[PDB]
Nucleic acid binder design. Sequence first.
RNA 1: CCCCCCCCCCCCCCCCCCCCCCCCCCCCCCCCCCCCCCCCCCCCCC
Lengths: 659, 659, 228
Amino acid sequence: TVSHEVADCSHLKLTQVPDDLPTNITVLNLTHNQLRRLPAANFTRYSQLTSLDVGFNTISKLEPELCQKLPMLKVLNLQHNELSQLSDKTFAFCTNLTELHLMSNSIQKIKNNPFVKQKNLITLDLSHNGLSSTKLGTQVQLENLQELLLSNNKIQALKSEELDIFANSSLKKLELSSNQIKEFSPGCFHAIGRLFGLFLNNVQLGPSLTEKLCLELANTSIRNLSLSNSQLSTTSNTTFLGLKWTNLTMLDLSYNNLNVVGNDSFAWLPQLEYFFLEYNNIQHLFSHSLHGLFNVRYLNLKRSFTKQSISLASLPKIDDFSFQWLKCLEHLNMEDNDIPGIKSNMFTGLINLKYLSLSNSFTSLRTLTNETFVSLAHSPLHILNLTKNKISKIESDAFSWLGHLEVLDLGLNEIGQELTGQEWRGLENIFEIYLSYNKYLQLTRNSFALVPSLQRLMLRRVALKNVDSSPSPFQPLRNLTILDLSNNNIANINDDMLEGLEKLEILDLQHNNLARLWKHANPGGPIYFLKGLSHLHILNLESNGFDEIPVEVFKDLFELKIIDLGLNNLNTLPASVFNNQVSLKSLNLQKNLITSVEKKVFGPAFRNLTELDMRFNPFDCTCESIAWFVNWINETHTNIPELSSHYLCNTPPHYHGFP
Amino acid sequence: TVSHEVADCSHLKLTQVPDDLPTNITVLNLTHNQLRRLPAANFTRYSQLTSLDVGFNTISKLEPELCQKLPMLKVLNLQHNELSQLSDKTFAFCTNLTELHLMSNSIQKIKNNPFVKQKNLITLDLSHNGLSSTKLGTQVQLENLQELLLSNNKIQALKSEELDIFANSSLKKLELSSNQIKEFSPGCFHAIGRLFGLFLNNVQLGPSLTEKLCLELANTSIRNLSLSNSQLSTTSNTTFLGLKWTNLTMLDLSYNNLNVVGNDSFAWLPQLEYFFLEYNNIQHLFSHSLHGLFNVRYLNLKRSFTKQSISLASLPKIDDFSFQWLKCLEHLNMEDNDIPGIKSNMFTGLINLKYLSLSNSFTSLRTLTNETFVSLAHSPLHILNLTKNKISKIESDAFSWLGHLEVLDLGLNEIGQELTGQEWRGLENIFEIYLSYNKYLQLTRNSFALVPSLQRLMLRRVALKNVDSSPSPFQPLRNLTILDLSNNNIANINDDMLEGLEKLEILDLQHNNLARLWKHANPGGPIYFLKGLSHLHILNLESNGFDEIPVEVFKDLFELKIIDLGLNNLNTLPASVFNNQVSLKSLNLQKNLITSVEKKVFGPAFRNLTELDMRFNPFDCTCESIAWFVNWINETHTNIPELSSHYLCNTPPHYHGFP
Amino acid sequence: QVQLQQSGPGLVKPSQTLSLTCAISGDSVSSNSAAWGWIRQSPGRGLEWLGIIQKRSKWYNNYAVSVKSRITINPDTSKNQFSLQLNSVTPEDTAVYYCARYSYPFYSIDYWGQGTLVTVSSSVLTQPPSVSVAPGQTARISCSGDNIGSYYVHWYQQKPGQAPVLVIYEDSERPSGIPERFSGSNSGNTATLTISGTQAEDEADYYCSSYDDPNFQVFGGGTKLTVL
RNA sequence: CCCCCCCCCCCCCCCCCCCCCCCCCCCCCCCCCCCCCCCCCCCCCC
């Protein structure tokens, strides 16, 4: 029963409440216990409680005396219990409660008036119960109640009388999910004082019942309406007619298996701002299908269209000018679809669009013709996502229409070509370009000469070729900050590849083959490709096969903080190499061949660190080579994980395995 | 000028012969020197010479006094000199010579009688000279001369008169290669006393001139006749008519670009025993093409047939019963051919065949139907070679006709199937089966149950599957001696896989994955799959990833001599492991992680060896772990290559790199 | 405060309709903080709830099953009244009819009509029938039933010729104006009205009553308390 | 005897991720041989 300010007793197998806790405890948690009964006599000591979570237990019934000992209680949680009986005195003395959870209590019927005696209640939960009617009392109470949950019940109708108790209550959420409701009575929602949101997830309504619901929702203050998994197979221009008289802003139609969308179906939602259509089965989207939605600010179409079938090849076709009505659209999530391709008028009309995601949106977008994004000429796009589209070729002037583009995501594709440099024309405001996980890329002298504003360039596992050209391909990128060149099997790097990149901060070169470039036997001398990077912060050189470190590689990294050198073949290091690393924070040298750690090389490096990884190193336990290192280990504040588990000497056999 | 019994002065750039050598030297070699002249006054000391090789020099002319100083000379070599003038006194005093090389001496004309004064000459060479006629004198001499070479000369005719000097000489070899001979005179070969072999390689004869040659060769004692690269495009039943009256046994027709072979062409060679047809362009072999060759004991057909051409797909077709005439055939080399496939009567009639090679003999022999070798039912085959035939499947009873088969070579194929065990039925006398370098093989419990006489089984780089069956697939192979299972990426081995194989001697398991089977943390205990092999001699376990050696793996290898454990991850070894290796000869532990060599483990192993390979090991220079090893290194007779080059300690840094 | 004045014939022929009117002053018949109902009392029995109506969203009425097929309680919003219409009367309907205000949330009755005696001619709460007490001696009136441990118990006092007066509500609460010597308790299936030091003015009939889920209101048989 | 709600614990299956070892293929670099070619220099013959 650990407790400093709140009390936790979760999964402690308690049968009775403890009697030794501070008097001024505010939270008392007893989830996942076996409290058969909860006598109130044990609560005399605990008279300062605010939250009382006694859920996931086996309490049969409570007593009103429990509320007497708690004068300031605000939270009462009784999830998954057997409290199937309620009385007027059960919650009589409790009046400051702002939360009441009764989920999965097997409550059958609300008898007379269990919730009259409280007026400050905010949230009430009755999910997973056996209730058949929404009647919670005879008179009107629950003045401040804002959220009411009735999901997973056995309610089959919503009569007007049963909600007469909410004639002056502002309901911000009326959860009625998983209830087989098949009849709606007139005035059922008009009787509610102020209904702001309705949730009917997993409720088998159907199109006609949905229309009846919308008609019953006319001339009310609803703002949200979730109809997820409602078996809404088909919509028409009259399905949402009843919403013409309201100001609905959020509508959810996910998992409804919406086979087709009718013409002018959503013309009755001029105030809609958030529309959801994810995980549907739409086979055809008409030009006027999205008519009347000129105020939507966020549209989701993830898996909204039908998948390909070899039987008929029923690829979901999108008609031209289908998105012309979304004038105020600002976010279009359109991932995991099977569209045949992009047309010249697919995205016409989106004059306020700022985010388009097309991750795996097309079956085969092999070639990015310069006329592909012509429909996005007037769209002020900022972020474009094109991952998992199986793109195989990008022609010149492909992105010449996205003048406002800032982030381009072309990763996780099969792009195999030579970057002539004309593919990036028109990206005057580009900031980040992602190209990782491609087939193979062949850089040229002027590959990135048309995008001087670029700041991020990720090329992880792309099999870079001709990166060792005499003019550095990264020279025009004066504002580059993050560069990733990992898993490219790079062999040759020129010393001037990173020349002029003063603002570079994060550089990744792990999983490459640069061992030869740093050995002293390399013809032409070692390659010092890390000169001039005064602002470099993070360096990654894992699995490079390095066997020798030149003395003056890190001679100018005055602001280096994180350096990675794990999974290498380092055995000896030059003296006085980390002198300029005055602000080093993390040093990684795991899975290396280092046998000696001396102050002459690791002195300045161990000045003020916060992490250290030298686990799988065959250390040599000798006072000439390890005594200083173990002495530094003894007294330090740097975090060294698995210090006593893997920091084991290998030689001599006298100290074989001794930490 | 190193010399103990013979004198060698090759490539020493000598200008004059040395004057400080033992008097009783028998061989004096001066090849590749610059001896402008060879005065005989310097040969007074050297009067016991038998061989005098002064070839590849620049001697202009010799003097008869040279022979006077050498009373017992037998070999005179003058290759590649300028001795273009010969006289009767040049070789007068020399009479015991049994060898005389005059190759590439730019000899123009033999004037009168340079070789009369000797009678014990055996071999005479005159290759690469400017001779135009085969006249070597006027009268008859060279009684004992057996080999005469005249290759690469400028002889254009073989007149009868020019060979009148050999009326009583037995010529076992008359080399006339590379001579543009275009006319043969009657009696040219009849004038020769006893001609046994003629060589006309690279001589542009043609079919008509070949027939004229054969007619001129009638009723003589010839036994060999090489006509390689003679541009013999076509043969007929009358091309070799002149050989009807002789007893020719060896005939060479290689590189002749023989497009077609005429019907009954070789019916005039009943005494032929060795026939060569390699590297030809035969497009069709008739049934009666090889008629009359019922005495051939060795036929070579390597690349004898035309290659495939995409223009016409002119695959060389072999008619049925084409080899029915070779009754006494015992060796058929038939490699590198483009035959469409094997027929039911292709090999019918070979009742004495004992060796058939079909390495890359067919373009696509994908399936080995049980009726494929029906033509070999009565052939007493012993060795069959089927490499590089792109065999993809072997059906049951495929080798049911080869009852006398002993060696089967099925390696370097693409055989991917499951060995049900019925493929080897009928191999009652099989000894060796080769299956290395295949696609993938799936063994079964009774894979080799039908061939208990098997002794060799090579399965290198075959991707063995289901080798860990509960009954050992090698159990029926009671007489197995050599087993190769390298590069198969084998993971799991049962301890009883090699049970009962007492006669096993050579076992290969290198380049596999058996590290887990020997670690102590392996569930079920370490696998001791090397028990009962009392006759094991050679063991290979390279690149297995081993990290720990069980103490009692080599507890029964009483006759082990060669053990291979290189390219592993061994760091420590159990004490008293090599006790039973009393006859160990070679121990290989290169490219390992061993840091300590102690007498407790390597004592009995270093008893009496002959080789040791521990080059790339990070040894620990410490008197507790290396002192005994270096002391044993100091005094020993075992061969340790690169002892002072790679046996370098890695730790401590004080001894870093010190041998 | 709230005045309820009843009016109507005090004599009805059998098989006719019994019509009465309760006129409200000082309160509203459409009030969302009260309910308006009729109960009756014959000397052969105690108190019997007949019907009730309350204005919440629409007009809702709840009737007792004994007279459900005959009773009708309609409000007159224009005149701030509510009526009582009991068809097919029979001398068994001869009784004193009271109109009353049920005060939220306990449905206790704070205001009654004067009561109209009507003659027709041409769960169980158990109380002891009588309790005799000396002046100054504490009186204890018990009330048993299954509704005791499941509902709040109210206690009403009725003097001869007068409407009942709520002396205790919600098992123990006492309305203002009631002497402090009155108190109530509820232990198990037995409620108890304790009059500490019964005075002469406390001699009356005491009825225990409670709310009830199917039948709305249930009254005890009544206990006659005598100050000797 | 039945229908359910919880607490604890032990197996089994699927998927994701990480790590060790190994195989195959490929890339970069180096070395050792074989063949061919080119140039420089010296020494002779016709």
